[PDB]
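hey team, just a heads up i'm posting the complex here instead of the shared drive bc the drive is being weird again. everything in one block, sequence lines first with there labels, then the predicted structure for the whole assembly after. its four chains so it's a bit long, scroll down
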Amino acid sequence: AECSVDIQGNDQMQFNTNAITVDKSCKQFTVNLSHPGNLPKNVMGHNWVLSTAADMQGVVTDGMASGLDKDYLKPDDSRVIAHTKLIGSGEKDSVTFDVSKLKEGEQYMFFCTFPGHSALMKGTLTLK
Amino acid sequence: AECSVDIQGNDQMQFNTNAITVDKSCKQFTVNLSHPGNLPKNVMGHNWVLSTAADMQGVVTDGMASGLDKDYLKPDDSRVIAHTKLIGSGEKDSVTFDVSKLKEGEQYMFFCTFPGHSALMKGTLTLK
Amino acid sequence: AECSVDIQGNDQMQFNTNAITVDKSCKQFTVNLSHPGNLPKNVMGHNWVLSTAADMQGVVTDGMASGLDKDYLKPDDSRVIAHTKLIGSGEKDSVTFDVSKLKEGEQYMFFCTFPGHSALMKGTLTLK
Amino acid sequence: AECSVDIQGNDQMQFNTNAITVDKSCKQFTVNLSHPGNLPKNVMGHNWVLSTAADMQGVVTDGMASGLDKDYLKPDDSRVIAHTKLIGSGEKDSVTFDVSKLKEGEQYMFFCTFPGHSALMKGTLTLK
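-- predicted structure starts here --
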């Protein structure tokens, strides 16, 4: 994966990576999320959401209040740099975003906003 | 108080307590479960289930496997000392059990069998 | 009561609540923090710290940098609206603050700054 | 790797893998644990402990009661198949165990027993 990364969310509320690096020479970066396992989206739906570390908490709180129907994300949330939809087992979603929306030296966090799973599903993303 | 406890499971997939003490003088013990929040039973359902620590894993696994239609509990599971029904937010349930079924010197755990919930929603129960 | 709340942080690294609402007719609000359990402060010390949602990350990261000696909080940290001391099991601490420092419309978070604790020990505080 | 795996535990309470497969052909299996980061052992000590899925909760409860000085593991615990010592950042430990102590069709869990961290640091081990 050069300018892309393949990441999996399983039924035990675990991503298969805790850390992503974005090569600064990438014009865009793609994340391809899949969900191994058997659990359905209402019970174990995963999304991959990106924001700065300082924004993560506000996005997670507000996403919980938009609920179910809105994929646990505030529509047009300005703190969200990029995100997939919420997928259940056996689904896949990908998201491509412009690497110019990231500054060198700033800290970023990727996470899932399913209620109560964010604490277990989060990691860091850094430009390199 | 003394022979009853009120317990809450919320939308952040947490219980308000992780250790309960049942006084040996109680002939019976009553647990009153309520679910503050907003999320419905098929997204954030909660139940309070009691087994020995050694049996917890298997009750959870077979519960999970039984599906929502069985309140995520295997029917007539003999490992389950006592259990409430699965409740969505704004619902409540109550269960009373005979303290004679607990023996001193054994480790008991109470937990939720809804998928993924036992990771945080669990706690000890101890005769004193 | 009415303008106060009792919070417990335990040995499983959780708080007993994840949402506090402060009634707008309160001139001051008091948090009473206790630590049920048996673990010492250098291993499972807890505190209750309040900031806006967007400042929580800076406060946690700088707290962790100040170390156990400084109760894992940057001295005179201007983003902290109010906080208790860091306590071990069997200890208690209470803090009262002025409600005029909050405003309707703003997202507040309460959390614990002992390393690792904010992952589970956090909740929303809201002025209603 | 060939009947060995190198795994890391970071300061955000995360192992860098959540599933370990032991091939049946292995007479022994080795785990090599390292702790990247800066946090000391009383705050963020990590250990890799193996047991059946059924014994994990009791191994976790009794480890908590044994104390930091005993590396949060009950001494000579019958349920522990293999384990490392508790390591702070900058340290390394490894453990080699005989694969004849595992049997087909039994579920095994690896986890850390530092208080409050096992819900975040656990995964599956499978004999294939």
